[PDB]
Design a protein around this nucleic acid. Structure first.
Ligand code: CA
Ligand code: CA
Lengths: 152, 152
DNA sequence: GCAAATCGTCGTGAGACAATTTCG
DNA sequence: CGAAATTGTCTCACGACGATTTGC
């Protein structure tokens, strides 16, 4: 529940609208009650020679980590509670991904009720459909419709 | 000289560091005193379906324009005076391209002297190399070197 | 059984120039 | 002569997922 400096948030909001990405995914996995995991991820991609900027974010945001993948690296935050805290404070300054942010927050706020009824779970999966819609989605496979293929 | 709002500057500096670009070029042209023109440019690129954002920058910067080039568009600003005013204010908030920003500022300020001496002008082209090196330059051809090739 | 991590890849959406032209 | 525009495009540097594993 760390509090972030406004100016920091202002700048980061901009940098995120540029290189950032708010992602919601439906992950097929048998070990889950409804055969799928709900996964929310905030990230920031950057050329690895500039990994330092991403490393600094780790210290500034206070959570998350940086992963390597060749010529590029990523700042990653998958932790639901800290993610909810971070986006809550970032959301008011975003402009290109403010809705995917508010959609992720709504998804988190609903997680519990969702693990209860197959319908709450599907409706939430409709939220993840909207997020992918908002982003420049191009390699998406598991949608809420595939989840609809739970009917059993 | 327009007086931009700090918060708009904070957010934009972040957006610029992400999708923006601060460019300094040496264009060979036999109409110029030293057979080359010095071109400085501030730009923000974005998928054209998201151009409203660039059109938005036109109205907020109060100068410059947007051009389409397929599925992608660009907010462009190359007017020397507006560029100086604009970059002087954005610079203190830049984190990734502050150096190129300040290089342009300095280039802009040495312009007239760079016009009365193949040496000043020579030195200035050396300022441009630096901006390119700082950037992820990958198709550059005309450098201060190819320009020293005037001394003949 | 679920949160969070590990490791990879598709197809761009950018960044960063070049070549040439326009016109006060 | 030169400030600014117009048009083109190379090479990524990203965005945005997917498959599977780890761990309590
Ligand atoms: Ca972007
Ligand atoms: Ca970038």
């Amino acid at each position: 529940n760390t509090k972030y400096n406004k100016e920091f948030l202002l700048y980061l909001a901009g940098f995120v609208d540029g290189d950032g990405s708010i992602i919601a995914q439906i992950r097929p996995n048998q070990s889950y009650k409804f055969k799928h995991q709900l996964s929310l991820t905030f990230q920031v991609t950057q050329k690895t020679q500039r990994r330092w900027f991403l490393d600094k974010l780790v210290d500034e945001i206070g959570v998350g980590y940086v992963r390597d993948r060749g010529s590029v690296s990523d700042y990653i935050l998958s932790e639901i509670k800290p993610l909810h805290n971070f986006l809550t404070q970032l959301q008011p300054f975003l402009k290109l991904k403010q809705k995917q942010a508010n959609l992720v927050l709504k998804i988190i706020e609903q997680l519990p009720s969702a693990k209860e009824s197959p319908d709450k779970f599907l409706e939430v999966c409709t939220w993840v459909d909207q997020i992918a819609a908002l982003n420049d989605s191009k390699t998406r496979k598991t949608t809420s419709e595939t989840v609809r293929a739970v009917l059993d």
